[PDB]
Amino acid sequence: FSHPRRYGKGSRQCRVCSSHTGLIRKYGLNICRQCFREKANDIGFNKFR
Amino acid sequence: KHKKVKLAVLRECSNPTCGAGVFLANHKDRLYCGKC
Amino acid sequence: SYRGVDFVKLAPARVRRRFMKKLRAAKLAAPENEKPAPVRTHMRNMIIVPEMIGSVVGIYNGKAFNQVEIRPEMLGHYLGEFSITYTPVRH
């Protein structure tokens, strides 16, 4: 009922929406690129320049 | 489509966890019980 | 023949980096002087070694299992190399 999912896009998902595409893995966020835009201010990422 | 024929109203081996309810099925040389 | 002549120590890099038992039970369970009954498989990534020679394998290319007889010159090649996965386009 399962085949290996230790790497590639199927190994990891967005921690918020569980989407496998558009994931941001920098610094270990593991948050979709859209969910990160939605809740970036909460994490502490701001726009300065 | 597993039907589980009713199996209407009704030995011993290793792995002593079997509590006298492990009667083997005898088709031919079938030393293997329902549990294992 | 092969490169001079298991039989993997005299083989290219991929096949040695990688390193159906019913094939023999389909080989001998039939009269001689004809080809063995086909053995069907999905494993296109299986390498042909000099033990399945002379057998008949139905390789899955996604549908409509393709019938291939194993020849001595197929050694070192993948089973999928002989079951084309698409249709020629005729352009």
Binding site: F1, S2, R15, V16, S18 | - | -
Partner: protein, 65 residues
């Protein structure tokens, strides 16, 4: 026992947190299948005694009166 462990944990502890992984063999705290936990508290949903919230695929369940 399959649901007895789940009910015992639910009562003794008071709440439950279950990650939304329907193939994780071992729940973090309860020694049962994660799917078993999720389906047990789904049975224990508004039919009675449990309120569930999702909050990033984690299934917070809490007991009611």
């Amino acid at each position: 026992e399959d649901r007895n462990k789940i009910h015992q944990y639910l009562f003794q502890e008071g709440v439950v947190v279950a990650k939304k992984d329907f193939n994780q063999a071992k729940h973090e705290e309860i020694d049962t299948k994660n799917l078993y936990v999720i389906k047990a508290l789904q049975s224990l949903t508004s039919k009675g005694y449990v309120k569930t919230q999702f909050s990033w695929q984690y299934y917070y369940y809490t007991l009611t009166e």
